[PDB]
Design an enzyme around this catalytic site. Structure first.
Site, PDB file in Angstrom:
ATOM      1  N   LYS A  37      65.219  78.414  16.138  1.00 33.15           N
ATOM      2  CA  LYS A  37      64.288  79.375  15.996  1.00 33.15           C
ATOM      3  C   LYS A  37      63.013  78.892  16.391  1.00 33.15           C
ATOM      4  O   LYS A  37      62.575  78.099  17.441  1.00 33.15           O
ATOM      5  CB  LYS A  37      64.457  80.311  14.702  1.00 33.15           C
ATOM      6  CG  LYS A  37      65.860  80.397  14.448  1.00 33.15           C
ATOM      7  CD  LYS A  37      66.439  81.437  15.500  1.00 33.15           C
ATOM      8  CE  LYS A  37      68.160  81.677  14.974  1.00 33.15           C
ATOM      9  NZ  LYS A  37      68.439  82.003  13.560  1.00 33.15           N
ATOM     10  N   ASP A  49      66.506  78.026   2.438  1.00 30.00           N
ATOM     11  CA  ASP A  49      66.753  77.975   3.981  1.00 30.00           C
ATOM     12  C   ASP A  49      65.135  78.541   4.315  1.00 30.00           C
ATOM     13  O   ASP A  49      64.784  79.559   3.919  1.00 30.00           O
ATOM     14  CB  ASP A  49      67.680  79.120   4.247  1.00 30.00           C
ATOM     15  CG  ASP A  49      67.770  79.251   5.974  1.00 30.00           C
ATOM     16  OD1 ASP A  49      68.755  79.717   6.296  1.00 30.00           O
ATOM     17  OD2 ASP A  49      66.901  78.980   6.504  1.00 30.00           O
TER      18      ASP A  49
END
Lengths: 392, 392, 396, 392
Positions: free
Chosen positions: A205, A180
């Site tokens: 994000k 990730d």
């Protein structure tokens, strides 16, 4: 090979193929029609080039995917409705009962929940390992181990993993490595180049960067991505990304390099400022020399990122006072937005937890996490300054 | 209680709470900020209203959910990124290994795939039963049987289930009834009012009405929907609906009564036409007296719907040729758009299988499925007429 | 055979688009792009002249807008269309290109307030001569024509009394003297009335109203001959207004047009029922609705409009105190000024729009102290009846 | 007073005022309702109210407007459908027959068209003057002179005006000074702080920055802006800005500073490169020492900008050959996008015109204009370098 910024703006699109349109048209359509039915037959197997639905081969989504693949150095990309969409879609396809998955010491809270209260409750073995400890990892491998999954840096202490090291071990045992890479983005770290098989993002994000969409990306080999597309996404999750949201994401990616440059430059000044203050016990920012893993961080990350973690003397008490006094930073859980954000998990997310067991999760009493935005550093400094004074 | 159309336009919204805006503002935002940490603390035990993150809830998504729940007559709603998003999220949270799920004899292809190649490979037991045959259903019930999932009408032949009769048998053994109500919409059929615990939609279809979004809805009790929200959507699928797409879906829902009326009136004329044509072997429209379950269809659905299944005398070749001849209908695998659509599973979605393999799953060689759209009926009849001459 | 025109609904959903020419996409892709590029520079030389058919810059043209325009053209029965940022965008862009100082424009007796304002306080102050005529009186129109008369502009039905004009009769006078006829067709849409088929040169819309149907966008359309629409595109829109339609909003407009026929059927059927109900109520002094025989221009309405529309105006007994209390008693109808939304709207000129004025100033301009105006929406008629019934009770 | 970037992200918005929403909601609504008729009464000549119709006032448009006001340092702002909408709405409000407008010697093509083929054919008088020449400007003033309109820098050759000098002269005759600030943006130049009364922007260009919206901004003193809103916009143009586009515009503005810094750095390099090339007869770039008005540019512009114009020696042919050789730069007539753009007026925008008319207008046969984008500078150089070679 054109540079990163160039690719982030241009890759996979020529205006001449869409009536000269400088910005690609948004394919806000749920379905696609066929010229014949023999053309339709081919589409479901695979041997004619084209597309058959919004849940598979929408051209707006295809462009996003290709472009993310290029930025991360992968062969193939997949766009999904959220980061959890990307993580679940991936893990649901790679794992079956009897298979084992190794995990970093700490994970994103909903990633944690999915593994322990979701896929782990369907007969998949969960095991936690420190992914900077190559020796402990090698001792953890069993012949059932199909997937190794972690974040680097991981929340909340910015714990780094030795991606090239982990990948070497995994390549020996036939294990798939899934990283990730939300915190860095491909601009700062490319884990596929260090030997990972798959990377996953919460594009919500930094990639989007404007806090207005929810989206996830998977990047890796053609063979892994095809499987995740046709099984995880198609059958098991249904986490389809809206073509409208995908075009906003491509829009945000066009300034990724500049935004991350500003996030990092602001975060460093703020971290260096925090170091010199008497209310701060300790800091975890990868660009300070006192950061335990400053060496490994620089081998994998080209800059130290936008996230700052620090602890306050006074614990839970000093946190609440610090958080409530912030007037420019917002009190919220996300990261990677233009707006600066602050989170103190002890009194926000994890005030449903007890102080006696809080330390089991690696959560210091006074830990406050900052996502440093794009605002003028002087205003961010002044806001932090007065909030430290109000925490005493 | 105001009428359907009034609620489809108005329910859950007063302009006076949003500066007098007639159309609700679109909350295109990933994250929500808190006034203090002790206010934030409340929201991570469900103690305060408002919200924290769009993967769990968002005021645009809440309004869609409230409205959709009003129209189905249920307590609570959940919005997801697709129909498969709705189905997977639901079942992932309701089933664990050892549990049996009882399925209708035929299912939507991707739903079949989820069950047989997804959750059914994680140790969940599957059994198929003719849901019209209440004796055989009673006979199939074990205490391991946790969920009864069907569509009514179902693909591919419009087969139906006595929903209240199935609910009765569920109440007796203590099983949860999940009905896929995509085809009918809450306008023609309300399974919650006949004993079902949960309904799921591909809002991609009639509810949207315009072919531009992908979306899913779950409606049922607050208890079950809160679980599906907090486990299935939050941790297990990540299929978050874009607020932009939710607002379009709401716009489509405002004309749902008008569109379904025209959908049904057009299909009825088209059904009666097809029954009289020499090229047609047999036909399945619930609005024809020759429909096997005509009585059950007038009992459960307030109108016969917009879908038609019929079989051509010339088998697979006649189907192909019929499909290729269509000039106004498009060849596509969706339904419920303003545009009339057609598919012939034997040459499109199921082509590489053999005649034996397709008869096993209920698909005739010459089965054609029409989604009758909102165009002038004379133009649709003319297009169907010539395609039938072409079929020979 | 195949030279038969497809029906209105068919064309509202399909006209000028084939999924096959855009990758099978069932819904056309949205060209949310400000600018277009050229393969050679010689391809770009022709596209600022008129030789090569293509695309230059979205303030002139864009494929999402073009589709929208070819579709509205088909529905109105015109050669061409133009799409603009608002209704007033369509009107100003049209009148700014057709008129110059010294020309006269003949105007209907009543106009939308912003159109009235544009003509008197805008273009009329730049040397353009204005003249009002009752467009239902063809003798008075014949009589007011001069050699300087360049444009006849009017709405039909007209804001707010729903005064009608004889479109065919106006166009015949215009053929004889040589004027360009511009009809604002906002109230009817192409579904109920097609002024171009009756002899008008141009029609304008506030597509913000029924064409959108859902209250979420602002948009205008102009439909007419290729030469005039082109002129308007390249002079009015490009140089004089810059009222560019967003391709996003145009996509939504095309979405709303796909149900135009169904929504208008329901608007009309709801207003007919509501009008007949209001006529039989004690508190109602008089009612104006084209589908009632008591409508002053009943037979003209029946001749030009295939259905009587979604708008009602009525008067309450009891004056302003009755109207005020009627409006505040509404729980389903919203108090607002617009029309052609899914939601039913009511305005009461006395206590709302014309509040600054006195009861004496409102006797002038024909605005009764109990004049309510209704945009009938798409809600269940029994709920709308009930809301009006309990509101009348409270207005007593 | 917080910094530019802080205000570009935050000004005029508190998340706490909209249920914590980090990004503000998009008010995509044509109409607003009223709680009573008395509240309604005070919005049609209304003192203490919010808004009535999106063609006059919408919260999303209002936020964009207040934010743009803050960045230009002016009292009030107004959003419109295009830059031409902003210009025309302004000039239709301020001029009447018999008034004179004083123009910069050169203008953006459509602005010139508006003036000479629109408002100038309605009785308004036009006079072109050099706005660096303060004595010639003073000689040109007459009692009819009501508006002084110009761009700084100005197409085609980056000619500058002495804004503070012009404003001093306008002050003595009571005239209104209107500056088109599209090229600089308020990040580089704030004409209102130099004494100008109104500024207009084609926000279509740099303000958006991503080539996807058409939008206009006017900023200035309250009373002027109010009249342009209620007369020019409301009555005379109808150039209403879509709330969706306003929200995208506001998204783009959050990176204006970062984008502009990069536009300038890329253009500075390319100008340095182009000045030394054999094929280049002349170059116009404010950042070069050889730029005629170097000192005036540095007084008004904090950075030299992203636009370059230069002349090729080989005339019309060299222009044509250069443009066609470009692989990364697109051939197109806009500016301020992330993608780099090029136009050669003599074979593109002004091809129909004679060589004699182009010289009269200000256009050289080999004049090429570059909108330098945000790509990697090494790629942009490669592309320009090979195009310069193909110019032979």
């Amino acid at each position: 090979l054109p540079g990163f910024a160039t690719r982030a703006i241009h890759h996979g699109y020529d205006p001449q193929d869409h009536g000269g349109a400088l910005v690609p048209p948004v394919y806000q359509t749920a379905t696609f029609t066929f010229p014949t039915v023999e053309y339709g037959a081919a589409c479901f197997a695979g041997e004619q080039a084209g597309h058959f639905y919004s849940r598979i081969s929408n051209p707006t989504l295809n462009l996003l995917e290709a472009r993310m693949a290029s930025l991360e150095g992968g062969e193939a990309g997949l766009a999904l409705a959220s980061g959890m969409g990307a993580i679940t879609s991936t893990l649901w396809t790679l794992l079956r009962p009897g298979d084992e998955v190794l995990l970093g010491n700490t994970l994103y809270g909903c990633t944690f929940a999915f593994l322990h209260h979701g896929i782990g409750e369907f007969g998949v073995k969960l095991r936690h390992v420190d992914m900077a400890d190559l020796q402990a990892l090698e001792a953890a491998m069993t012949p059932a181990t199909r997937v190794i999954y972690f974040e680097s840096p991981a929340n909340p202490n910015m714990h780094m993993a030795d991606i090239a090291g982990v990948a070497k071990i995994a390549r020996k045992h036939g294990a798939t490595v899934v990283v990730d890479n939300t915190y860095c983005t491909p601009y700062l770290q490319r884990p596929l180049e260090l030997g990972a098989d798959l990377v996953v993002h919460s594009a919500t994000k930094y990639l989007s960067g404007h806090g207005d969409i929810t989206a996830g990306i998977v990047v890796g080999s053609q063979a892994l991505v095809d499987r995740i597309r046709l099984q995880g996404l198609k059958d098991m999750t249904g986490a389809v990304l809206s073509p409208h949201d995908a075009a906003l994401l491509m829009r945000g990616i066009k300034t990724l390099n500049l935004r991350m440059d500003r996030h990092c430059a602001n975060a460093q000044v703020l971290a260096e400022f925090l170091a010199r203050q008497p209310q701060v016990e300790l800091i975890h920012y990868p660009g300070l020399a006192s950061f335990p893993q400053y060496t490994l961080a620089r081998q994998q990350m080209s800059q130290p990122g936008g996230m700052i973690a620090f602890e306050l003397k006074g614990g839970i008490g000093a946190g609440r006072r610090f958080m409530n006094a912030l007037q420019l930073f917002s009190r919220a859980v996300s990261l990677g937005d233009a707006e600066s954000l602050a989170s103190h998990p002890a009194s926000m997310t994890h005030s449903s937890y007890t102080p006696e067991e809080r330390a089991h999760y690696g959560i210091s009493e006074g830990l406050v996490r900052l996502s440093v935005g794009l605002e003028d550093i002087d205003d961010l400094l002044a806001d932090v300054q007065q909030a430290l004074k109000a925490s005493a």
